[PDB]
Design a protein around this ligand. Structure first.
Ligand SMILES: *[C@@H]1O[C@H](CO)[C@@H](O[C@@H]2O[C@H](CO)[C@@H](O[C@@H]3O[C@H](CO)[C@@H](O)[C@H](O)[C@@H]3O)[C@H](O)[C@H]2NC(C)=O)[C@H](O)[C@H]1NC(C)=O
Ligand SMILES: *[C@@H]1O[C@H](CO)[C@@H](O[C@@H]2O[C@H](CO)[C@@H](O[C@@H]3O[C@H](CO)[C@@H](O)[C@H](O)[C@@H]3O)[C@H](O)[C@H]2NC(C)=O)[C@H](O)[C@H]1NC(C)=O
Ligand SMILES: *[C@@H]1O[C@H](CO)[C@@H](O[C@@H]2O[C@H](CO)[C@@H](O)[C@H](O)[C@H]2NC(C)=O)[C@H](O)[C@H]1NC(C)=O
Ligand SMILES: *[C@@H]1O[C@H](CO)[C@@H](O[C@@H]2O[C@H](CO)[C@@H](O)[C@H](O)[C@H]2NC(C)=O)[C@H](O)[C@H]1NC(C)=O
Ligand code: NAG
Ligand code: NAG
Length: 1873
């Protein structure tokens, strides 16, 4: 068992080693791909980011100073690793380092304690004034001293002063403002801003807010009140001008009172020193503070100058205030127009629409929520370049980031949308409520944990199977091609029938093909591990996975190899079939979430899908910081993924299923590869081979293939078997061997049945089929070694058998060369010798001389002479002339039944015609007849043709005395008879064999009409093929049109409603601080009610919230540590050095116990989170929520989006109440101005001081991944505030605010973008119609190629067919074939009503484009027919090249034209649109331009278009059409020029031809010379021949003689280098058409069409030869009648027998009556009845008066059919004469055979040598003798004849036979030597 196993393994290894190029490329193919992958990975290393925190952001509702402070400081959004002060529950602002806050606090704390001083001063002044109609001075002095001392202890004043006295260097004003915080003057400010890029970008972001223009469409007084309430903040802001002008008016007055009022001031100051002196050092320090004698110090002048400078700076800052940025518009359309006009000068900011519920103008929305007032709806319109897009909510590809980038994602902040929303909401709540609520809103972004960003892992998981499949496609194709090639040549059948079993072959193939896959897998695992692609993973698991996949793919390849039956077809189709199974993985991964878990296992049946699922599981497990390892082989990383063990099990199950399916399907072909006149009494009775009434019945044929055969064979005799094809000979051979079991009868061989003995009869059996059994890569030595080893011979003595056989076959010199496919013809003798290696007693041969050269034929025959002893041999060969030489006994079968059998002596050849007496001439028939009758009455006259006379001598009464007297008289008369020659031949076995077989301008118009009919019939006969190759390509795109519009077309962004409920179920916060206030409780209750919670009764409300239970281990961990509700969580690990993780993972004890929660009616979850950080909790608990959606990473649904914290008051001491008291005391008492110039200012200062309480605040935590969370939560907060402030009642339910979002429709550049720069559906349609239409043009070359490889085209050309007409007809038929799919696709476009292809202006463009596309694309495929030799591979290559060039050119030019950045891309595409040439690229450009222009017309016709945009314009599609139509005929011209690129008797006949030419002689040859290139010797050199037309000429020769060269030169196949060959007086060189018009050519090649029938060919030829239409039918009838064809009339010519092909070729040649008919090898292995019809037809045609020249190997026919023969060797004639003279001249002597029952040589040889002087002998055997009498005997043969008549009495002789020098005497001479 093992022996054949490793023999097969060694044979496969020998195959593999002999093709180094394939092995090297197979090894090196995936290495480059994985090197590319490794380089790609090396390009982008992973990134790491630490834990991140963000600062707070205020809003204008909170205040003015904090809002601007935030706007200025938090421009940059720097991430903070530590905690920020704003997130703690207590603090709100984080700007104590800010100078402004310190200044405000200092001012408040100083003015708080100064009330007593100012009040005392005021009351003193008033009492002094009242008494007008010293102690107050002292009190005022002390108060001023105290205030001066207090203001001295204020550093912030010192820093601000030091800031003021500085030059104007550095950068500009805003940098100084930022340092202090964190109109030509305006023109200079803008210039300074543009001076520095930082200030440049700051001003770019800030300017639209400053210089905007707010608008509102409705103009009712309600909206006017709303707008006034809106800009109340702007009204308050523009107050600095009032104080500026107040200072500007007051300063001059006090200044005038300051200087030149010096005497008076000195007077009071001198008065006030002695006031304190006589009542200390504190006073003069106060005096120095006043600086009354101020020269060294600086108080007054500098204070005045600095106050003026600061006021001027503030005025300059406020100079460019917008002042009035609020306008109104009457209508929405007018609003849009005015907004666009403002956008023209960069003035527009945002438009507001107060859409009312009563208006009912709501697209896709309810007109109103309910009847009655109290509902307000607001739209905000802004430029699309600012507001975020409004088409999708969540990102389509999850990223592991916090999404904090102010330029890209944070658009609502620097666009000002939130500011306007907050202002409008505050105005609306103020107007609706009727009160003045206060709530400072703050925005806080939730923190994000430390993470690692790596884009490579997801694409790796999505792309690894693709790389593996493209890596192993080559190996799959090679394996399937090798298997199919082996199974095609039936060698597997020989191995199975010769002793092997199916299991051994399958295991050998498996273990042969499992090597390279495992080697590649090992190399890939090594490069993956060492390439850092999959780090931290143990290689063993990956290697096992890859090995399982390799096993699955190799068994899948074996399964795939069970469909095809052609080598190259299988090689081409296997790769496509295997790659086509990978798409379902892509389809599944696209719809990953949709598919249920039930279908996953079902889809995993295909190997690539299972591998992809395993790969994604491996990648997901890799991302968790630990690759594949033994720790977690059987653990599922996620709830809905597969562990690797399940994947491996599924792979092995699939492999087993595929193997079993292949084993079952191997039986799809059962078996198919897709009269008693006898004698049994030999002298040696050795029944070695015997069959007794065998029976078998094939399923296809109801009649049994072979009937009962009771004949038995005998050892020691070379028995011969004769029969017809399909007459049971093949069935008998199959049954005798092990191919099929014996169905009936007995087949006992050597006493044991073949079926009973099984393998025990193999050691002594010999089978040699007609098909060769050889291996191309091996050589003869290992061939015989392998065969001897497999047959069971011991390897010890295999060497002697090997060398003995190789020396016996005479291949000693040719075995050391070690070449198999480098030799031809010789291999037959080696193949037949292989059957003799085992020394089997019984050997079977089937056609051992099928096509071998005669010069070696005797060779193999000699081998049979070497093994004619001690062995039984049974040969079954169709021919007869070889059978007689080796025939000890002969058996005959006919119709699956034995007819006769016996021995070739008279016991079998019972024929009346005994001997044939031939008389030749160089006189008179009556005289010869009278002489013959006188000598012997017995004589028959059968032949009387001129120059010969054949008589028949009856066998009965063969009295040799009378014949001897007759021939002696002839010897005494032949001298004067002028005959000078005669002969007596015996009965040829052919005639007796047959007898016993039946004993038991209009011309070319009709030519092209015929060609069109032929093409139409050929196309129509393949019904399924034509439908498949026409209907399918059109309907593919036809049905793909409707399904290609998945991608939505671009359009206006829809109006979106903003609300938290639009996301779904989620988790929110309502954390609260300082609950000691009824208003805060009311606000919290309003928030709870708005969240969707119902107020329960108090008894149930007591337990309205429930705390989830804590696990025991978590509680134990918390208790073990020291954890408080505020204290930090236990811990949480991070990314270790090297061991990176996507997200931190730490135990559930982190974050504390689960907080109490409740569930609302809408599925929302609310959580009560007071008493914590509320920050560390979020950081710890974030990844747990997201981990669920991490499996697919496509549309991740987070739970936490936002939350509220009710921060109340602010820890600090502003004490603004006493500030208001001081301000009102100053206003009422000091300087009461009735005009209000100061009174209104003091009023607003009092209002600000009293409003400084800031009763409460509210912080909103938002998650930025949700795109519209910010505005939704702001709206919810505003609605909750209004609900809280509203009184209880029904109106609470009926009052609400709705905020929407609706960007302005479009501008021009957005049109340019969204009209064509997407074009996804249009591009897909264009490329799809590019691919689908490309298959048709390559389909036409199949027919041309298959006619070119066959000699059918050549046979057609030897008619009257000109190449021009042929090519034109092919082109026209291709037009007719192509016309249908174009109509189908155009009707499809009409059916789907595509807008771009339905208008009256664009339809002709498409029609002409498609039609002319086909017209100009068909001729390009024609030139490819010549080079290629295989149809399917040529079709595949042409289709691939067409698709490649088309898609590459089109997509390259497309991607170049869009996304243009630099002028270099502009020029190149222009050239890429000028080079043209390719019709594929032309069609692509035309269609894509059509669709682009239609799209731009559709976009522009919505607006004012004013452009015709004609599709038919010259510069649009016209140039392509013109260029391609004018180049169309160029391909036809080039291909036609490529096709037409080609531009002693021997001596006496030579002299006769040289001296002149005969007019009657049709064939005249002069200087016949053919010189071969590179062979150093011409094939034929200087011959000549003159063939008369009234007789039939025959030419003969050995291989290499050059006869085929002569035939091809006469035909015209070979270029006529030199020589004259003229037929019928018409020269081939002068006019080849005239020579070929009347030539009837019949080659050995079966140039036939499978679909076409014989009668179709005959009718086609007849109508090509000018036969009238009516006479064509009768000509076809006569042509079939002269060959029969009654049973084959309707059958196609392809499905005929072997001889029927040649007979129909002869019929085709003879039809039309050509001047000369040439036949090359017309009789090669057919039934003798076909030969009978053939010689009948040829005698008829030669009698008709036409010349026929025939050349073949069997010349006996020519002896029996023609009257002139010529032998030629190596281009030199040898005989060239009349056939009888040829035998008389060179064939020389005569031979004699004797058959003696005693089988003793001497008694016969004595008088045989006595009769003639010669003593030549050959093959001296008892069965048959051969004696060569002296050649050229002058006397008659009668000298023996009568003598023989006596010697029958001397010795017992069975019979004597004489061979009187026939034509095959040359073959006898060759056999002898
Ligand atoms: C809320 O939880 C946070 C922790 O999530 C508490 O703040 C943390 O306080 C510790 C104690 O100082 C900080 O540890 C420090 O780490 C630095 C790192 O270099 C180290 O140099 C110091 O010696 C110290 O060990 C920790 O950084 C800090 N957390 C953050 C994010 O900065 C906070 O106290 C909790 N709130 C409470 C208790 O009210
Ligand atoms: C931006 O898009 C809006 C919305 O499509 C455009 O408003 C639309 O303008 C057209 C005028 O070109 C209006 O068509 C009119 O319809 C009435 C019937 O309601 C008909 O009687 C008129 O004869 C005219 O056909 C259309 O109603 C109006 N609205 C919609 C929803 O289509 C707007 O014009 C676009 N921007 C610009 C600058 O055009
Ligand atoms: C707020 O809006 C109102 C009306 O829309 C403005 O009232 C007028 O504003 C212009 C220029 O701003 C003044 O010239 C008029 O005298 C104002 N008339 C009245 C009756 O007030 C108001 O000015 C706007 N507020 C601001 C700061 O511009
Ligand atoms: C606050 O200052 C304003 C001046 O800017 C005082 O006068 C008001 O001015 C606006 C327009 O600027 C008018 O529409 C109002 O009618 C004016 N009077 C009032 C009472 O608002 C305003 O009086 C000052 N505030 C207080 C409380 O006196
Ligand atoms: C903004 O922050 C980035 C990143 O830290 C820094 O490089 C840049 O200088 C900052 N720019 C400004 C204007 O603050
Ligand atoms: C004030 O008056 C004095 C008187 O000599 C004069 O010199 C001075 O220029 C005036 N202005 C100021 C600002 O001192």
């Amino acid at each position: 068992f093992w022996t054949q196993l490793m023999l097969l393994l060694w044979k496969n290894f020998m195959y593999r080693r002999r093709q180094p190029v394939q092995l090297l490329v197979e090894l090196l193919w995936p290495l480059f791909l994985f090197f590319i992958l490794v380089a790609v990975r090396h390009s982008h290393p992973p990134l790491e980011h630490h834990e991140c925190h963000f600062p707070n952001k205020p809003l204008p509702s909170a205040g003015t100073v904090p809002w601007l402070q935030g706007l200025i400081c938090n421009v940059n959004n720097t991430c903070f690793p530590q905690l920020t002060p704003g997130e703690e529950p207590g603090r709100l602002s984080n700007f104590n380092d800010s100078l402004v806050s310190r200044l405000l606090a200092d001012a408040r704390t100083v003015l708080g304690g100064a009330s007593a001083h100012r009040t005392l001063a005021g009351l003193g002044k008033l009492i002094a004034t009242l008494r007008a109609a010293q102690e107050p001075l002292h009190s005022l002095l002390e108060a001023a001293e105290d205030l001066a001392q207090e203001l001295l202890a204020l550093r912030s004043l010192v820093e601000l002063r030091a800031l003021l006295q500085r030059p104007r260097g550095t950068s500009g004003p805003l940098e100084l403002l930022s340092e202090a915080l964190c109109s030509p003057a305006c023109s200079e400010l803008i210039g300074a801003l543009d001076s520095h890029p930082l200030s440049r970008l700051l001003w770019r972001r800030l300017k639209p807010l400053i210089l905007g223009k707010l608008l509102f469409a409705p103009d009712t007084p309600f909206t006017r009140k709303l707008m006034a309430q809106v800009n109340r903040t702007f009204e308050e802001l523009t107050l600095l001008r009032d104080v500026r002008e107040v200072w500007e008016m007051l300063g001059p007055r006090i200044f005038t009172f300051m200087n030149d009022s010096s005497n008076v001031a000195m007077l009071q100051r001198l008065l006030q020193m002695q006031d304190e002196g006589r009542r200390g050092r504190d006073h003069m320090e106060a005096l120095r503070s006043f600086l009354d004698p101020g020269s060294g110090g600086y108080s007054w002048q500098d204070a005045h100058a600095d106050v003026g400078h600061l006021v001027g700076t503030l005025g300059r800052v406020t100079e460019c205030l917008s002042l009035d940025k609020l306008e109104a518009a009457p209508s929405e359309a007018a609003l849009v127009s005015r907004a666009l006009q403002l956008l023209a000068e960069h003035r527009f900011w945002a438009g507001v629409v107060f859409l009312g519920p009563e208006d009912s103008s709501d697209p896709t929305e309810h007109p109103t929520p309910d009847l009655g007032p109290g509902h307000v709806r607001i739209k905000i319109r802004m430029d699309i370049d600012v507001v975020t897009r409004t088409n999708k909510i969540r990102d389509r590809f999850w990223d592991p980031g916090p999404a904090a980038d102010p330029l890209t994602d944070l658009r609502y902040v620097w666009g000002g949308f939130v500011y306007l929303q907050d202002l409008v909401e505050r105005a609306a709540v103020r107007v609706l409520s009727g009160a003045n609520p206060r709530a400072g809103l703050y925005l806080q972004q939730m923190p994000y944990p430390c993470y690692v960003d790596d884009v490579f892992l997801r694409v790796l998981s999505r792309s690894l199977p693709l790389f593996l499949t493209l890596a192993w496609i080559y190996s799959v194709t090679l394996t399937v091609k090798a298997v199919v090639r082996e199974k095609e040549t039936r060698l597997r059948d020989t191995m199975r029938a010769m002793g092997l079993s199916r299991a051994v072959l399958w295991l050998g193939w498996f273990l042969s093909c499992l090597g390279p896959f495992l080697l590649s897998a090992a190399l890939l695992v090594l490069v993956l591990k060492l390439g850092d692609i999959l780090p931290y993973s143990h290689p063993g698991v990956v290697f096992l996975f890859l090995a399982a996949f390799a096993v699955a793919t190799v068994t899948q390849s074996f399964l795939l190899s069970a469909f095809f039956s052609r080598a190259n077809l299988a090689a081409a189709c296997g790769g496509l079939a295997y790659f086509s199974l990978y798409l379902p993985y892509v389809l599944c991964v696209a719809w990953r979430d949709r598919l249920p878990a039930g279908g996953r296992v079902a889809a995993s049946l295909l190997s690539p899908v299972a591998f992809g699922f395993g790969c994604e599981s491996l990648a997901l497990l890799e991302e968790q910081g630990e690759g594949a390892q033994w720790h977690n082989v059987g653990t599922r990383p996620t709830a809905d993924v597969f562990s690797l063990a399940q994947v491996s099990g599924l792979l092995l199950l699939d492999a087993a299923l595929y193997g079993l399916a292949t084993w079952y399907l191997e039986a799809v072909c059962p078996g198919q590869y897709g009269k008693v006149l006898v004698e049994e009494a030999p002298p040696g009775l050795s029944p070695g081979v015997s069959v007794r009434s065998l029976e078998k019945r094939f399923p296809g044929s109801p009649q049994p293939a072979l009937r009962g055969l009771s004949l038995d064979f005998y050892q020691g005799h070379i028995t011969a078997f004769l029969g017809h094809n399909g007459a049971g000979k093949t069935t008998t051979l199959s049954i005798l061997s092990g191919l099929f079991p014996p169905s009936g009868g007995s087949a006992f061989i050597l006493g044991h049945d073949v079926r009973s003995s099984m393998a025990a009869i193999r050691p002594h059996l010999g089978v040699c089929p007609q098909y060769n059994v050889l291996f191309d890569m091996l050589t003869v030595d290992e061939h015989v070694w392998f065969y001897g080893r497999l047959k069971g011979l011991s390897a010890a003595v295999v060497g002697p058998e090997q060398d003995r056989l190789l020396q016996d076959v005479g291949l000693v010199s040719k075995q050391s060369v070690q070449t198999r496919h480098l030799s031809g013809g010789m291999q037959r003798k080696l193949s037949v010798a292989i059957a003799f290696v085992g020394g089997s007693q019984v050997v079977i041969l089937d056609e051992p001389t099928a096509g071998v050269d005669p010069a070696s034929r005797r060779g193999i025959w000699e081998l049979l002479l070497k093994y004619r002893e001690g062995r039984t041999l049974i040969l079954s060969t169709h021919h007869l002339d070889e059978a007689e030489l080796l025939g000890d006994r002969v058996a005959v079968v006919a119709g699956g039944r034995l007819c006769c059998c016996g021995s070739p002596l008279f016991l079998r050849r019972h024929l009346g015609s005994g001997y044939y007496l031939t008389l030749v001439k160089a006189v008179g028939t009556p005289q010869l007849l009278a002489l013959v009758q006188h000598w012997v009455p017995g004589a028959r006259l059968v032949e009387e043709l001129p120059h010969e006379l054949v008589l028949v001598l009856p066998y009965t009464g063969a009295h040799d005395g009378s014949f001897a007297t007759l021939f002696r008289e002839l010897d005494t008369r032949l001298a004067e008879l002028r005959l000078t020659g005669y002969g007596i031949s015996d009965t040829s076995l052919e005639e007796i064999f047959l007898k016993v077989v039946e004993e038991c301008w209009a011309l070319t118009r009709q030519q092209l009409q015929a060609l069109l009919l032929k093409r139409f019939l050929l196309a129509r006969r393949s019904r399924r093929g034509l439908f498949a190759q026409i209907v399918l390509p059109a309907l593919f795109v036809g049905l793909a049109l409707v399904f290609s519009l998945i991608v939505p077309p671009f359009g206006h962004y829809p109006a979106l409603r903003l609300s938290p409920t639009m996301y779904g179920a989620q988790v929110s916060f309502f954390s609260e601080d300082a609950p000691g206030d009824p208003g805060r409780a009311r606000l919290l209750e309003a928030l709870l009610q708005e969240a969707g919670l119902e107020e329960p009764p108090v008894q149930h409300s007591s337990h309205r919230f429930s705390a989830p239970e804590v696990p025991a281990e978590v509680a134990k961990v918390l208790a073990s540590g020291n954890w408080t509700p505020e204290s930090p969580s236990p811990a949480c690990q991070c990314s270790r050095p090297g061991a990176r993780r996507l997200l931190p993972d730490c135990p559930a004890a982190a974050g504390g116990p689960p907080p109490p929660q409740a569930v609302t009616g809408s599925g929302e979850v609310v959580q009560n989170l007071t008493g914590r950080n509320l920050s560390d909790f979020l950081v710890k608990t974030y990844p747990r929520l997201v981990r669920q959606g991490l499996k697919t990473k496509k549309w991740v649904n987070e739970v936490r989006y936002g939350g509220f914290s009710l921060g109340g008051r602010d820890p600090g001491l502003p004490s603004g109440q006493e500030l208001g008291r001081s301000v009102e005391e100053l206003w009422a008492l000091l300087s009461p101005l009735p005009g209000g110039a100061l009174d209104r200012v003091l009023k607003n200062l009092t209002a600000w001081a009293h409003s400084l309480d800031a009763q409460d605040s509210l912080k909103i935590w938002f998650n930025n991944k949700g795109w519209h969370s910010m505005v939704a939560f702001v709206n919810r907060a505003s609605n909750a505030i209004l609900r809280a402030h509203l009184p209880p009642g029904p109106a609470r339910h009926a009052h609400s605010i709705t905020t929407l979002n609706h960007p302005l429709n479009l501008t021009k550049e957005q049109l340019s973008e969204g009209a064509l720069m997407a074009s996804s559906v249009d591009v897909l349609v264009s490329i799809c119609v590019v691919f689908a239409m490309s298959f048709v043009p390559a389909s036409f070359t199949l027919v041309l190629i298959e006619e070119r490889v066959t000699r059918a085209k050549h046979l057609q050309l030897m008619g009257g067919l000109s190449p021009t007409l042929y090519w034109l007809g092919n082109f026209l038929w291709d037009m007719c074939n192509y016309l249908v799919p174009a109509c189908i696709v155009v009707l499809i476009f009409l059916a789907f009503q595509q807008r771009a292809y339905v208008a009256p202006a664009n339809l002709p463009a498409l029609l002409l484009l498609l039609l002319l596309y086909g017209w100009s694309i068909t001729p390009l495929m024609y030139p490819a027919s010549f080079f290629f030799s295989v149809p399917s591979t040529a079709y595949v290559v042409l289709t691939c090249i067409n698709l490649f060039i088309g898609i590459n050119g089109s997509m390259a030019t497309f991607v170049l034209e869009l996304f243009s950045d630099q002028k270099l891309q502009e020029v190149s595409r222009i050239l890429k649109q000028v080079f043209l040439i390719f019709p594929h690229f032309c069609l692509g450009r035309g269609l894509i331009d059509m669709v682009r222009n239609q799209a731009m017309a559709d976009a522009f016709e919505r607006l004012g278009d004013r452009q015709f945009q004609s599709p038919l314009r010259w510069e649009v599609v016209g140039k392509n059409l013109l260029a391609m139509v004018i180049q169309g005929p160029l391909f036809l011209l080039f291909t036609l020029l490529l096709q037409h690129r080609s531009q002693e008797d021997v001596a006496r006949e030579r002299e006769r031809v040289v001296q002149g030419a005969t007019q009657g002689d049709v064939l005249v040859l002069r200087n016949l010379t053919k010189v071969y290139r590179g062979q150093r010797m011409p094939a034929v050199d200087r011959l000549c021949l003159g063939i008369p037309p009234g007789e039939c000429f025959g030419l003969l020769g050995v291989n290499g003689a050059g006869k085929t060269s002569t035939f091809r030169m006469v035909t015209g196949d070979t270029l006529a280098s030199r020589g004259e060959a003229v037929l019928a007086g018409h020269s081939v060189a002068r006019e080849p058409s005239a020579a070929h018009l009347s030539m009837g050519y019949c080659p050995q090649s079966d140039a036939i069409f499978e679909l076409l029938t014989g009668r179709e060919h005959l009718e086609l030829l007849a109508r090509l030869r000018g036969v009238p239409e009516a006479q064509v039918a009768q000509t076809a009838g006569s042509g079939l009648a002269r060959l029969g064809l009654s049973w084959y009339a309707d059958r196609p010519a392809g499905t005929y027998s072997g001889g029927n092909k040649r007979k129909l070729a002869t019929a085709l040649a003879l039809v039309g009556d050509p001047a000369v008919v040439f036949l090359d090898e017309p009789t090669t292995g057919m039934d003798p009845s076909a030969r009978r019809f053939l010689w009948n037809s040829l005698l008829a045609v030669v009698r008709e008066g036409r010349s026929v020249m025939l050349t073949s190997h069997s010349m006996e026919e020519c002896e029996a059919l023609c009257s002139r023969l010529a032998i030629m060797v190596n281009g030199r004639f040898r005989c060239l004469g009349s056939p009888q003279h040829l035998k008389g001249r060179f064939a020389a002597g005569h031979t004699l055979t004797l058959r003696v029952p005693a089988a003793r040589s001497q008694p016969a040889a004595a008088f045989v040598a006595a009769e003639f002087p010669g003593a030549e002998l050959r093959e001296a055997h008892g069965g048959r003798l051969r004696f060569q009498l002296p050649p050229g005997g002058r006397c008659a043969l009668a000298r023996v004849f009568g003598e023989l008549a006596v010697h029958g009495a001397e010795h017992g002789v069975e019979d004597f036979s004489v061979s009187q020098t026939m034509l095959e005497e040359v073959f006898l001479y060759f056999s002898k030597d």
